Design a binder for this molecule. Structure first.
Ligand SMILES: O=C(O)c1[nH]c2ccccc2c1CCCOc1cccc2ccccc12
Length: 150
């Protein structure tokens, strides 16, 4: 679903960008927007907690990935689909996929690869919506994400 993709892209890319810069983007978003703003707000709350709770694991995975350049960022999808497609599907695992994206985005700013944050956000959005389309539709997309963590 291109609507699920374009909404997910805006939520993920906004969170990854603002985690990297340290500054939040202004309130107006694209289509839907009201649901997306609520989703970004719950994502900041839950996602910041996940980064703190899994700091050692995130540090370990970052080291393993050994990200140095733009080519390393594109080779990521291979591990991303491996780890994320095996096992159960729930909102906690979706938050973990996104929060680790934020953790990687901060590292990219550090190594002067900030231009890779958008392609990375795009890659996460694509893997998420492509592999979990039906489950996301059943949960009423980003409306169900907000409700679940309410
Ligand atoms: O779901 C889980 O078990 C799990 N465990 C982890 C333990 C550590 C770090 C993440 C995870 C996850 C998230 C899914 C897989 O994420 C990824 C894997 C690889 C590269 C990535 C790059 C950008 C964003 C997500 C990535």
């Amino acid at each position: 679903s291109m609507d699920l993709y374009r909404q997910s892209l805006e939520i993920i890319s906004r969170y990854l960008r603002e985690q990297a810069t340290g500054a939040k983007d202004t309130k107006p978003m694209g289509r839907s927007g009201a649901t997306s703003r609520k989703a970004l707000e719950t994502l900041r709350r839950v996602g910041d907690g996940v980064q703190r709770n899994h700091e050692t694991a995130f540090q370990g995975m970052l080291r393993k990935l050994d990200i140095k350049n733009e080519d390393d960022v594109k080779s990521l999808s291979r591990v991303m689909i491996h780890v994320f497609s095996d096992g159960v599907t729930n909102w906690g695992r979706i938050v973990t996929l996104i929060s680790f994206g934020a953790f990687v985005a901060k590292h990219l700013k550090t190594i002067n690869q900030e231009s890779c944050i958008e392609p990375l956000a795009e890659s996460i959005t694509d893997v998420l919506v492509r592999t979990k389309r039906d489950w996301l539709v059943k949960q009423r997309g980003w409306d169900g994400f907000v409700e679940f963590f309410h």
